[PDB]
Curated annotation (Swiss-Prot):
Changing residue 9 to A: Attenuates sweet taste-response suppression properties. The chain holds residues 54 to 87 of 87 of the full protein. It comes from the Eukaryota. It comes from Gymnema sylvestre (Gurmar). The presence of a 'disulfide through disulfide knot' structurally defines this protein as a knottin. Disulfide bonds join 3-18, 10-23, 17-33. This is Sweet taste-suppressing peptide gurmarin. Expressed in leaves (at protein level). Changing residue 13 to A: May affect protein secretion, folding or stability. Peptide that strongly, but reversibly, suppresses the sweet taste-response to various sweeteners, including sugars, sweet amino acids and the artificial sweetener saccharin. In rodents, potentially binds to a sweet taste receptor present on apical microvilli of a subset of taste bud cells. Highly effective at blocking the sweet taste-response in rodents such as rats and mice, though mice may possess a mix of gurmarin-sensitive and -insensitive receptors. Has almost no effect on the sweet taste-response in humans.
Amino acid sequence: QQCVKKDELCIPYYLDCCEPLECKKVNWWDHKCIG
């Protein structure tokens, strides 16, 4: 499988980065995790 956390790329479709990291939009042409 594949995961996605920390300086990764947010993806809300059906995922949500690992924890305690999050997933949000830095721009409409962009995506990024949080913390």
